[PDB]
Write a protein that binds this ligand. Structure first.
Ligand SMILES: O=c1ccn([C@H]2C[C@H](O)[C@@H](COP(=O)(O)OP(=O)(O)O)O2)c(=O)[nH]1
Ligand SMILES: O=c1ccn([C@H]2C[C@H](O)[C@@H](COP(=O)(O)OP(=O)(O)O)O2)c(=O)[nH]1
Ligand SMILES: O=c1ccn([C@H]2C[C@H](O)[C@@H](COP(=O)(O)OP(=O)(O)O)O2)c(=O)[nH]1
Ligand SMILES: O=c1ccn([C@H]2C[C@H](O)[C@@H](COP(=O)(O)OP(=O)(O)O)O2)c(=O)[nH]1
Ligand SMILES: O=c1ccn([C@H]2C[C@H](O)[C@@H](COP(=O)(O)OP(=O)(O)O)O2)c(=O)[nH]1
Ligand SMILES: O=c1ccn([C@H]2C[C@H](O)[C@@H](COP(=O)(O)OP(=O)(O)O)O2)c(=O)[nH]1
Ligand SMILES: [Mg+2]
Ligand SMILES: [Mg+2]
Ligand SMILES: [Mg+2]
Ligand SMILES: [Mg+2]
Ligand SMILES: [Mg+2]
Ligand SMILES: [Mg+2]
Lengths: 133, 132, 132, 132, 133, 132
């Protein structure tokens, strides 16, 4: 059908601020289903760097990796109609109220959640976190 | 400008237990219930009249089938700028913050209907609440 | 044991915009709506029949007055052990966790009524939904 | 980096019991309370100062009367980009997802005030918390 | 009528955990109204010790005062029918789900909220926090 | 002081979309996740081990079939007095305020499992997370 899969990361600030269920709940409410899920008490920097490889040239690259390994993260593969972009809109940004980041986050770095932004990004990110493909 | 508008709560809302969730969003925006009917299964005729403008579209029959595949609630809501405001509340499955934006992800199963103009509002209210 | 029970949503619920809140608590416990009527103002007779057992109590008339001071919704709910479970959901204004426990604080204005026995449930359903 | 901004919770929030709902939205966005005062009734000259840029408008007097019709809370919030972020949270009655977009439907009774610039922020904070 | 007033403290853990609105919301929802309210970025130990004077002989007395001045608190005077005990039940305890402490707290000391437990306690506590009687 | 306890989120939670709702209640009580696994379908021998004390009961096989009818999540939670506090959170279908009391109404489809003793806790954690 229009069925898709996408990769979401719940970031360490979410655990810090006790917002894990709140975030997963918003995705659950829009009728997306968990296909795979993995809890990392601390992610290997290796995985983080791969995941953010497209960002390796940026000023914020290392500070961001630092944060991403500063506490637990959950990686989830979601599935549903048009999953990649719909879950991207749910994530939104810190400027737009009504989205996850819009309602709950206020920082350029500590922003609670990652979602794949394209078909190619999803395929690649899912592979990084669930290599057992 | 105080108006009235017609809302339908669709069978997917009952299936997924989103009924009160949906009504609550409209209630919290301060719109009031003027009349309301619960249909365990809506008469197919009523659904056909309701969606008449669409009779030529390819989705007409499938949509009718779905609209009759479970209960629905028909509600007349009152309030300032009600037709326009409740339409925004309804929203669409793309933009978060709305009923459809937060809770739906289908082109057919989208939880709620709301009139979109003064004319369709008058018409739909007469279809579901002829007692006027 | 699958049962049906009668619920009234009282005028204070409309006044304080707690309608969907109340219905949502029953919906989330997995009870289903079997029938439902919205009354902009309930006929005083219906209210008198409904509260007959209380006709001799000092609060009878004041209570009737309140019950007619705004809209109410009459609902028939279905589900396993529905009469007993929805009574617990209704609760009382003392113990938190229930509808009254969380949302009410009056001996008269207490948001919701729920049948309390198999007999009163049958009776009340006939008062509000005679079509049987 | 850090900014501070002035928020007013308006009397319609108390009347409609939405005070915690509004404060909660700003809290969930990680803004912190620096100062706060509850006014069972705000002195009229504070209200008039606060809206002084509006002194020539037709709605001026009526809005002041409304603002003095019940309790208000004045809060200084602190956080990154506080002024603009809280402005967007307030939003407007046409924009679902925001405070006014979800809970308000009036030109005047719109639940919340938030400063809209650095200068207005600085000035408004000194009106409500002149002890600084 | 049956009208009463009672004193509530929102404790420093509430600000720490971002649960201030959540707590005040539960009281607001049961139809109690704020009569006076005061924000303390940090309360004078003097006030805390008075407030907990009946506890001056206990092992936990000083550790508790320590915590009560470890961050902001809000003191509120609420009003409504039977306010003292109804708001006491709302507060509940860490063992009873459905109450504030029952749903949200898990510690003998860091327990989010105080509510007066009698007519005499209320009168005295209100006097401590809003001396302007 | 600290304890750890085993929680199972049952297939009815996935079917009814209450997974976040349940995890949220335990999160709001300040319990932390130590370990967690999602099982699209749990191997039947894990389920049977997990319920082994129940092997002679009449409901044994049927309950196992239910537990394998959809996804489940196994979580190790850590916090002060975790075992007993999470047990009370789970509660039962007769007790409003708890997970089962608010959201469940069945003898078997009751949303959540939580360990009920130190020994059962230790044993159940080793069934679902034997890597320790
Ligand atoms: O100035 C920045 C920009 C981004 N990031 C982090 C947060 C962000 O989530 C991630 C990827 O950056 P992006 O693609 O700009 O944001 P998004 O995650 O919204 O795609 O890098 C920073 O730490 N600082
Ligand atoms: O391709 C489609 C388009 C629409 N519909 C249904 C869903 C929609 O709610 C109804 C009316 O369609 P619309 O007027 O395009 O949508 P709306 O209800 O958003 O005005 O028809 C379909 O089943 N398939
Ligand atoms: O002193 C009273 C007692 C009761 N009632 C009203 C509220 C109540 O909902 C209704 C029926 O009374 P009940 O059977 O004692 O309460 P419940 O509805 O909890 O069974 O009468 C009063 O107005 N005053
Ligand atoms: O026609 C109007 C316009 C505004 N106001 C009130 C409500 C508003 O909150 C306040 C200030 O007006 P504004 O700056 O236009 O609105 P905002 O508060 O969104 O900046 O004056 C009215 O009563 N009538
Ligand atoms: O062992 C204890 C007991 C109490 N307290 C603190 C928390 C409590 O809120 C306050 C007053 O004690 P209480 O009267 O036993 O509890 P409550 O506040 O529930 O009345 O003292 C502790 O720090 N440790
Ligand atoms: O008659 C029964 C009793 C129990 N069970 C299932 C549901 C229950 O969660 C599990 C274990 O039973 P229990 O220990 O009595 O319930 P709990 O999980 O509350 O300890 O077995 C049934 O299917 N039928
Ligand atoms: Mg990106
Ligand atoms: Mg249309
Ligand atoms: Mg009775
Ligand atoms: Mg302005
Ligand atoms: Mg005490
Ligand atoms: Mg057991």
């Amino acid at each position: 059908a229009g069925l898709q899969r996408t990769l979401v990361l719940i970031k360490p600030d979410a655990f810090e601020r006790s917002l894990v269920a709140e975030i997963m709940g918003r995705i659950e409410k829009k009728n997306f289903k968990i296909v795979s899920m993995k809890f990392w008490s601390k992610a290997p920097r290796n995985l983080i760097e791969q995941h953010y490889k497209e960002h390796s040239e940026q000023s914020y690259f290392n500070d961001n990796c630092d944060f991403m390994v500063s506490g637990p993260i959950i990686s989830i593969v979601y599935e549903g109609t048009d999953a990649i972009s719909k879950i991207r809109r749910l994530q939104g940004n810190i400027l737009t109220p009504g989205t996850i980041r819009g309602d709950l986050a206020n920082d350029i770095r500590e922003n609670l959640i990652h979602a794949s932004d394209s078909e190619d990004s999803a395929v690649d990110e899912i592979s990084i976190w669930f290599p057992e493909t």
